[PDB]
């Protein structure tokens, strides 16, 4: 399928502030339609996939 | 006493059936500018029995998703709350919009509003007093109140202010059979006692609250009536010993210390008839880097023992102290659509 980024993987070795900032960036980037979001169950992993207002590398986007 | 989980279907921007939470002892609702966060607060007011006229809509059906623009998603919508109490099984309180009427349910048993609110009141949830809710601007509002404005606030919350009519009416009969005096002292004692039943509890608690908010034993805070014999007739004095400062009134406190003292008063007043959970809508708006972390850690400390904290916050220095984040984001659609993500902050150091 399409490229997909795991928020929980992105947050390895982060502190609370950095982890919260990555979680918030998913909300902002979803609002900007740069990504699409999927979460299966409460507190499961959150997966970002491409949205129609960003066509670059998601891996680079979240570096 | 714990709001465990909220379930929503087609309520304002929360289109479709959504699970909100589970909530932890300290949960922060966050997200970029949009309608969704404030719609979630209205969902909580709604499921706890709030009147339509207090939800800034003209009709009950206007709460159904899309009904504002003449395209309601369904003829029904609902909010439900799973409430947990130590030693008891979970109970689900649900309010369903069915056409133009509400339908109230406790564990899928249909009840009238009177019984619904009676059961919530037995839990400490008071929809008339909104004890479970701190609105936007409540800190800034309480910081601006003068001694006499605090007294009227205490007259309201204590239901002594509803004795104000019979009070001076029996005084009228007494100014003019030296027995209307005892009828006046009778109603005087009742107004005094209702006043002090509430006020003495608030005054007792405020010092420890101010201490914990300041994170300093050196701080202290004093509430007392200008008129000890008839407190309701005059103002309520509020004096603090701010950390490293002189004993000063509140209305003379430094801009940042002042908000901390207003916060202590706000919390002390809610300590009178506390709810088991506290929805704080941007209670950190009036904070700055002087006091943001102190207040956040106070909420954090309080959340373990005294009340479940559900905060709506725009400031990371505040909400990164929560155990959980409920992130609200928008979907593109005909109308504003809100959806949520849940994030467990306890997995990360700091």
Domain ranges (residues) in chain B: 2-132+275-347, 140-260
With residue A58 as reference, give the H or E element that holds it: helix A58-61
CATH topology of domain B2-132+275-347: Rossmann fold (3.40.50)
From the list B308, B310, B305, the residue with the least C-alpha distance to B279 is B310
Q: Provide the CATH number for the domain formed by B140-260 in this structure.
A: 3.40.50.300
Q: What is the DSSP string of B175-227?
A: H--TTHHHHHHHHHHHHHHHHHHHHHHHHHHHHHHHHHHHT-TT-EEEEEESS
Phi then psi for residue A38, to 5 deg, are -140, 130
Query: Is the distance from CB of B141 to CB of B283 less than 8 angstroms?
Result: no
What are the percentages of helix, strand and coil residues in chain B, rounded to 5? 40, 25, 35
From the list B303, B223, B209, the residue with the least C-alpha distance to B264 is B209
Chain B residue closest in CA terms to A40 = B341
Cα angle B214-B216-B217, degrees, rounded to a multiple of 5: 125
The residues, any chain, with a CB within 8 Å of residue B76's CB and separated by 6 or more, are B9, B10, B64, B96, B97, B98
The residues, any chain, with a CB within 8 Å of residue A24's CB and separated by 6 or more, are B30, B31, B316, B327
Whether the domain at B2-132+275-347 and the domain at B140-260 fall into the same CATH topology: yes
Size of interface A-B (CB pairs under 8 A): 68
Q: In whole angstroms, give the CA distance from residue A16 to residue B284.
A: 19
Q: What is the DSSP string of B295-311?
A: HHHHHHHHHHHT-EEEE
Alpha helices in chain B (DSSP H): 36-47, 113-121, 138-143, 147-157, 164-175, 180-214, 255-270, 292-305, 316-319
Q: In whole angstroms, give the CA distance from residue B262 to residue B139.
A: 6
B303 is in an annotated binding site: no
A59: exposed, middle or buried (Cβ count in 10 Å: 0-12, 13-18, 19+) = exposed
Q: Say if residue A4 is preceded by a cis peptide, omega within 30 of 0.
A: no
List chain B residues with CB under 8 Å of A19: 343, 345, 347-348
CATH top-level class of A5-61: mainly alpha
B34 is in an annotated binding site: yes
Distance from CA of B219 to the nearest CA of A (A): 30
Which of B22, B327, B330 shows the shortest C-beta gap to A23?
B327
Q: In whole angstroms, give the CA distance from residue B148 to residue B236.
A: 6
Place of tokens 């002292």: B185
Which of B319, B327, B348 shows the shortest C-beta gap to A14?
B348
> Beta strand A46-50 with B277-281: parallel, antiparallel or unpaired?
unpaired
Q: Is B36 on the interface with A (CB under 8 A)?
A: no
List chain B residues with CB under 8 Å of A47: none
Q: In whole angstroms, give the CA distance from residue B131 to residue B125.
A: 7
Query: Is the distance from CB of A23 to CB of A7 less than 8 angstroms?
Result: yes
Distance, CA of B130 to chain centre: 6
Q: In whole angstroms, give the CA distance from residue A39 to residue A60.
A: 21
B36 is in an annotated binding site: yes
- Quote the radius of gyration of chain A (alpha carbons, Å): 11
Domain ranges (residues) in chain A: 5-61
Query: Is the distance from CB of B309 to CB of B340 less than 8 angstroms?
Result: no
With residue B20 as reference, give the H or E element that holds it: strand B14-20
Q: In whole angstroms, give the CA distance from residue B204 to residue A57.
A: 59
In chain A, residues 30-59 whose CB comes closer than 8 Å to chain B: 30-31, 33, 37, 39, 42-43, 46
Q: In whole angstroms, give the CA distance from residue B340 to residue B86.
A: 28
**In the PDB record, what is the listed experimental method?**
X-ray
Q: In whole angstroms, give the CA distance from residue B303 to residue B27.
A: 9
With residue A26 as reference, give the H or E element that holds it: helix A16-31
Rounded to 10°, the helix B292-305/B180-214 angle is: 110
Chain B residue closest in CA terms to A46 = B341
In chain B, residues 268-307 whose CB comes closer than 8 Å to chain A: none
Quote the tokens at residue B104.
């109230």
Q: In whole angstroms, give the CA distance from residue B275 to residue B138.
A: 17
Q: With CB atoms and an 8 Å threshold, state whether B350 touches A39.
A: no
Strand order from edge to edge, sheet including B337-344: B133-134, B277-281, B308-312, B26-30, B324-331, B337-344
């Amino acid at each position: 399928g399409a490229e997909s980024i795991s928020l929980l993987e992105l947050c390895r070795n982060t502190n609370r502030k950095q982890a919260a900032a990555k979680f918030y960036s998913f909300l902002v980037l979803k609002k900007q339609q740069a990504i699409e979001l999927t979460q299966e169950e409460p507190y499961s992993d959150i997966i970002a996939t491409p949205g129609p207002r960003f066509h670059g590398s998601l891996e680079v986007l979240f570096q | 006493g714990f709001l465990k989980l909220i379930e929503i279907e087609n309520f304002k921007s929360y289109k479709g059936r959504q699970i909100i939470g589970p909530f932890q002892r300290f949960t922060a609702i966050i997200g970029p500018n949009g309608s969704g966060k404030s719609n979630l607060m209205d969902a909580i007011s709604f499921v706890l029995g709030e009147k339509t006229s207090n939800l800034r809509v003209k009709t009950l059906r206007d709460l159904i998703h899309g009904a504002p623009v003449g395209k309601p998603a369904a003829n029904r919508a609902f909010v439900s709350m799973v409430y947990s109490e130590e030693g008891a099984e979970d109970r689900t309180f649900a309010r369903v919009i069915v056409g133009g009427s509400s339908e109230y349910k406790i564990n899928n048993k249909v009840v009238q509003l009177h019984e619904y609110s009676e059961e919530l009141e037995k839990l400490g949830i008071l929809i008339k007093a909104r004890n479970f809710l701190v609105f936007q601007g409540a800190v800034e509002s309480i910081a601006m109140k003068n001694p006499k404005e605090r007294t009227a606030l205490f007259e309201e919350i204590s239901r002594s202010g509803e004795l104000a009519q019979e009070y001076d009416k029996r005084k009228k009969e007494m100014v003019k059979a030296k027995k209307a005096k005892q009828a006046f002292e009778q109603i005087k004692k009742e107004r005094f006692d209702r006043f002090n039943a509430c006020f003495e509890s608030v005054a007792t608690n405020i010092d420890e609250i101010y201490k914990a908010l300041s994170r300093n034993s050196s701080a202290q805070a004093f509430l007392g009536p200008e008129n000890p014999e008839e407190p309701y007739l005059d103002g309520i004095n509020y004096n603090c010993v701010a950390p490293g400062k002189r004993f000063r009134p509140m209305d003379n406190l430094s801009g940042g210390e002042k908000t901390v003292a207003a916060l202590a008063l706000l919390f002390a007043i809610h300590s009178y008839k506390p709810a088991p959970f506290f929805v704080l809508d941007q209670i950190d708006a009036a904070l700055d880097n002087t006091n943001i972390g102190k207040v956040a850690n106070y909420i954090k400390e309080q959340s373990t023992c005294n009340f479940q904290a559900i905060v709506i916050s725009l400031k990371e220095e505040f909400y990164t102290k929560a155990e959980s984040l409920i992130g609200v984001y928008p979907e593109q659609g005909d109308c504003v659509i809100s959806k949520v993500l849940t994030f467990d902050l306890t997995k990360y150091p700091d």
